[PDB]
Design a protein around this ligand. Structure first.
Ligand code: HEC
Ligand code: HEC
Ligand code: HEC
Length: 71
């Protein structure tokens, strides 16, 4: 519903999808062409190239934990 809560054992993550729906070439960057559950999105993938990794390269976004993780 615009905001996708990623229940975490170490603080939840408030990620605005409807918001992230843009700022991307033409979507299909994360999904890889196809909606639905993104494979077995693991905790490693998050910090990988499917959450942070992006920003790390996108040069846009927060990389801090408190930025992603919040109580
Ligand atoms: C920045 C990466 C990214 C982009 C770009 C993106 N999404 Fe998502 N999308 C996600 C993530 C992360 C989830 C949550 C997957 C999970 O939690 O299992 C998700 C979940 C979804 C879901 C599952 C239910 C829901 O409503 O969230 C749908 C449907 C979806 N995306 C559609 C799209 C479509 C269609 C596009 C563009 C054509 C798009 N998304 C663009 C990251 C992205
Ligand atoms: C395709 C690369 C990409 C991926 C993957 C991606 N994002 Fe972003 N992120 C961006 C872009 C682009 C912006 C810039 C948004 C702006 O300009 O306001 C951004 C900005 C943000 C911001 C700052 C704006 C805000 O809403 O507070 C947060 C927080 C954020 N991302 C969290 C996440 C989280 C959490 C995930 C993983 C579920 C994620 N992002 C996955 C591209 C990505
Ligand atoms: C760009 C957003 C983002 C940033 C920055 C980030 N994380 Fe994460 N982290 C996530 C997401 C998303 C998950 C998975 C949550 C889910 O989907 O259940 C996660 C999961 C985790 C998990 C495992 C989840 C569990 O099962 O408890 C740990 C540990 C973790 N993060 C530690 C950190 C630490 C430490 C930092 C800072 C040094 C950090 N994270 C910063 C997005 C981020």
């Amino acid at each position: 519903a615009d905001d996708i809560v990623l229940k975490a054992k170490n603080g939840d993550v408030k990620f605005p999808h409807k918001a992230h729906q843009k700022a991307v070439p033409d979507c299909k960057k994360c999904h890889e062409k196809g909606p639905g559950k993104i494979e077995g999105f693991g905790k490693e993938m998050a910090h990988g190239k499917g959450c942070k990794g992006c920003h790390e390269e996108m040069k846009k976004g927060p990389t801090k934990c408190g930025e992603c993780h919040k109580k």
